[PDB]
Motif scaffolding. Structure first.
Motif, PDB file in Angstrom:
ATOM      1  N   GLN A 138       0.898  -1.125   0.020  1.00 43.60           N
ATOM      2  CA  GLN A 138      -0.026  -0.068   0.020  1.00 43.60           C
ATOM      3  C   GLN A 138       0.889   1.447  -0.115  1.00 43.60           C
ATOM      4  N   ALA A 139       2.022   1.273   0.574  1.00 42.37           N
ATOM      5  CA  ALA A 139       3.063   2.447   0.640  1.00 42.37           C
ATOM      6  C   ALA A 139       3.442   2.602  -0.691  1.00 42.37           C
ATOM      7  N   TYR A 140       3.682   1.437  -1.448  1.00 42.23           N
ATOM      8  CA  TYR A 140       4.095   1.707  -2.939  1.00 42.23           C
ATOM      9  C   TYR A 140       3.232   2.048  -3.658  1.00 42.23           C
ATOM     10  N   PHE A 187      -0.344  -7.128  -6.035  1.00 40.55           N
ATOM     11  CA  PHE A 187      -0.192  -5.640  -6.020  1.00 40.55           C
ATOM     12  C   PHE A 187      -1.047  -4.778  -6.689  1.00 40.55           C
ATOM     13  N   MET A 188      -1.385  -5.349  -8.119  1.00 40.69           N
ATOM     14  CA  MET A 188      -2.191  -4.944  -8.962  1.00 40.69           C
ATOM     15  C   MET A 188      -3.624  -4.931  -8.269  1.00 40.69           C
ATOM     16  N   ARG A 189      -4.181  -6.146  -7.770  1.00 44.23           N
ATOM     17  CA  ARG A 189      -5.618  -6.345  -7.472  1.00 44.23           C
ATOM     18  C   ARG A 189      -5.906  -5.613  -6.452  1.00 44.23           C
ATOM     19  N   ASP A 190      -4.889  -5.989  -5.118  1.00 46.81           N
ATOM     20  CA  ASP A 190      -5.413  -5.394  -4.048  1.00 46.81           C
ATOM     21  C   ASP A 190      -4.979  -4.123  -3.461  1.00 46.81           C
ATOM     22  N   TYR A 191      -3.973  -3.643  -4.453  1.00 48.61           N
ATOM     23  CA  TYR A 191      -3.305  -2.136  -3.834  1.00 48.61           C
ATOM     24  C   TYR A 191      -3.591  -1.255  -5.061  1.00 48.61           C
ATOM     25  N   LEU A 192      -2.864  -1.541  -6.320  1.00 46.40           N
ATOM     26  CA  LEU A 192      -2.694  -0.534  -7.358  1.00 46.40           C
ATOM     27  C   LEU A 192      -4.211   0.145  -7.772  1.00 46.40           C
ATOM     28  N   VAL A 193      -5.010  -0.878  -8.163  1.00 42.52           N
ATOM     29  CA  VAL A 193      -6.325  -0.749  -8.765  1.00 42.52           C
ATOM     30  C   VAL A 193      -7.212   0.120  -7.662  1.00 42.52           C
ATOM     31  N   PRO A 194      -7.409  -0.469  -6.589  1.00 38.69           N
ATOM     32  CA  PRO A 194      -8.446   0.535  -5.694  1.00 38.69           C
ATOM     33  C   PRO A 194      -7.432   1.813  -5.103  1.00 38.69           C
ATOM     34  N   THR A 195      -6.225   1.959  -5.296  1.00 39.35           N
ATOM     35  CA  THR A 195      -5.797   3.219  -5.050  1.00 39.35           C
ATOM     36  C   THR A 195      -5.767   4.356  -6.098  1.00 39.35           C
ATOM     37  N   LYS A 229      -7.893  -4.461 -15.117  1.00 39.53           N
ATOM     38  CA  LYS A 229      -8.719  -3.106 -15.387  1.00 39.53           C
ATOM     39  C   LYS A 229      -7.574  -1.983 -15.720  1.00 39.53           C
ATOM     40  N   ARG A 230      -6.263  -2.380 -14.989  1.00 36.25           N
ATOM     41  CA  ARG A 230      -5.166  -1.359 -15.218  1.00 36.25           C
ATOM     42  C   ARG A 230      -3.922  -1.679 -15.698  1.00 36.25           C
ATOM     43  N   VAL A 231      -3.993  -2.989 -16.377  1.00 36.38           N
ATOM     44  CA  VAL A 231      -2.995  -3.510 -17.214  1.00 36.38           C
ATOM     45  C   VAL A 231      -3.118  -2.743 -18.453  1.00 36.38           C
ATOM     46  N   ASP A 232      -2.841  -1.515 -18.700  1.00 38.13           N
ATOM     47  CA  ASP A 232      -3.218  -0.957 -19.750  1.00 38.13           C
ATOM     48  C   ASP A 232      -2.140  -1.380 -21.032  1.00 38.13           C
TER      49      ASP A 232
END
Ligand SMILES: [Cl-]
Ligand SMILES: [Cl-]
Ligand SMILES: [Cl-]
Ligand SMILES: [Cl-]
Ligand SMILES: [Cl-]
Ligand SMILES: [Cl-]
Ligand SMILES: [Cl-]
Ligand SMILES: [Cl-]
Ligand SMILES: [Cl-]
Ligand SMILES: [Cl-]
Ligand SMILES: [Cl-]
Ligand SMILES: [Cl-]
Ligand SMILES: [Cl-]
Ligand SMILES: [Cl-]
Ligand SMILES: [Cl-]
Length: 433
Positions: A138-140, A187-195, A229-232
């Motif tokens: 989450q920090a990253y 990291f993508m599913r649980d952190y990057l996408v919701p952030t 959704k954000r693997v553009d």
């Protein structure tokens, strides 16, 4: 006596553009050559009239490392501690070059690749090697989102693309961070996408740029309903690998960016090396059908290898332009962002490789033909579905550097041109006037 058929109505992938990088103090090494040579290097890389016309710029997100030196080292990070943010534009030595190239040349695609998270996020407490701590995901994620927002709100730089990790497979002697494909999905599913959703981030994500050119590191995220959704864009390098199709990436309708390649083993600046990278572009456009293609450095201080298109000697304050800048310029100067690859006889004769592109909004087109062989080859180009009056050839060889030739008359949607051996020619024309 070979024939190439260019079809106007059979289209393929959209070209996002071409670019290079100035990471690891190489942007400051250009300024160390003086203002005159600095503008010449900017012009050789980004000008669409007498340069390569690169439309994308790749930079490093500062990690605060202490390795290297002033000629080749890391930059200070904007978050040196978990509880301290330092939005000092002097930490990023690439900001002055970005502002200059965006104003003078209109390069409006900015990509920042993270070589490594800060040392306080790493499992080994250092930006060199190691991995990201699981309690720091989450920090990253906030680290990436706050950088995109504040580079615009504080520095006025719009980050259009973000590279989450540079070569997650490799731990180097410099800034590096190892990831597994499962840890990238978490990291993508649980952190990057919701952030990124919570912060309204509109920048496209260039997925973890694998050192080898494959989609293996992105398959888990592409098959995850939330991470996809954000693997553009699926990013990858081409060090020691070959250009292959990305099956899962194409099925999900995402982009493919080859974000770094260079010659770290040899030092060839002749037309032979230049045609190697032009052939790499041809292979990248025909077999993988990717969208963007990059070189490593545009200008670097290494005069002993091919990590950069321009070799700068910091001692004498001079630079030398390799032939690969003009051979890549056969593609990058004319194929602008938004262009579209169309059908063309990819291999009409031995050692000749052709691709064709067009601009759907203006009607302009470009036909790039490579001849990495020893023989002259007369090629007859038949234009199917469009009838321009003439084409303008640009040729790079052992004695030519993106040299404009005499216009060639197109008679009944057909024209002929003999490709010199060890050369590359781009035919540019317009269907609207
Ligand atoms: Cl552009
Ligand atoms: Cl630092
Ligand atoms: Cl500042
Ligand atoms: Cl460190
Ligand atoms: Cl997983
Ligand atoms: Cl999955
Ligand atoms: Cl993944
Ligand atoms: Cl999916
Ligand atoms: Cl998105
Ligand atoms: Cl996309
Ligand atoms: Cl090649
Ligand atoms: Cl443009
Ligand atoms: Cl040939
Ligand atoms: Cl026709
Ligand atoms: Cl002419």
């Amino acid at each position: 006596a070979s024939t190439v058929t260019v079809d106007w109505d059979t289209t393929y992938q959209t070209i996002d553009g071409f670019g290079v990088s100035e990471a690891f103090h190489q942007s400051n090494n250009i300024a160390r050559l003086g203002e005159t040579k600095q503008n010449e290097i900017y012009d050789l890389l980004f000008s669409t009239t007498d340069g390569a016309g690169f439309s994308i710029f790749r930079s490093i997100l500062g990690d605060g490392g202490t390795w290297g030196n002033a000629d080749d080292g890391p930059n200070k990070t904007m978050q040196p501690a978990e509880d301290v943010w330092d939005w000092n534009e002097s930490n990023d030595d690439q900001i002055p070059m970005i502002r200059a190239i965006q104003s003078k040349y209109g390069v409006d695609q900015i990509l920042y690749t993270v070589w490594s998270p800060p040392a306080w996020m790493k499992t080994n407490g250092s930006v060199v090697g190691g991995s990201l701590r699981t309690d720091k995901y989450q920090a990253y994620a906030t680290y990436l989102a706050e950088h995109i927002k504040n580079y615009k709100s504080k520095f006025g730089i719009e980050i259009t693309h973000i590279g989450i990790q540079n070569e997650p497979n490799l731990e180097t002697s410099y800034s590096s961070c190892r990831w597994s494909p499962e840890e990238l999905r978490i990291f993508m599913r649980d952190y990057l996408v919701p952030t990124f959703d919570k912060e309204n981030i509109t920048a496209k994500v260039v997925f973890a740029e694998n050192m080898s050119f494959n989609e293996q590191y992105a398959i888990n995220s592409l098959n995850d309903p939330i991470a996809v959704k954000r693997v553009d864009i699926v990013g990858a390098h081409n060090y020691g690998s070959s250009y292959i199709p990305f099956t899962t990436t194409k099925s999900k309708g995402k982009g493919i960016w080859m974000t770094e390649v260079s010659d770290m083993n040899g030092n060839d600046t002749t037309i032979n090396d230049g045609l190697r990278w032009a052939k790499e572009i041809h292979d990248f456009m025909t077999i993988t059908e990717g969208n963007a293609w990059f070189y490593w450095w545009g200008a670097c201080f290494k005069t002993y290898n091919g990590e950069g298109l321009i070799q700068m000697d910091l001692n004498s304050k001079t630079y030398k332009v390799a032939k690969r800048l003009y051979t890549i310029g056969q593609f990058s100067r004319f194929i602008r962002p938004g262009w579209q690859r169309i059908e063309a006889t990819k291999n009409p004769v031995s050692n000749v490789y052709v691709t064709a592109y067009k601009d759907p909004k203006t009607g302009k087109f470009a036909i790039v033909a490579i001849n990495n062989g020893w023989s002259k080859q007369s090629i007859t180009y038949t234009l199917k579905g469009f009838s321009p009056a003439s084409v303008t050839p640009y040729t790079t060889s052992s004695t030519q550097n993106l040299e404009k030739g005499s216009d060639i008359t197109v008679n009944n949607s057909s024209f002929s041109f003999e490709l010199a051996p060890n050369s590359i020619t781009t035919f540019v024309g317009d269907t609207e006037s």
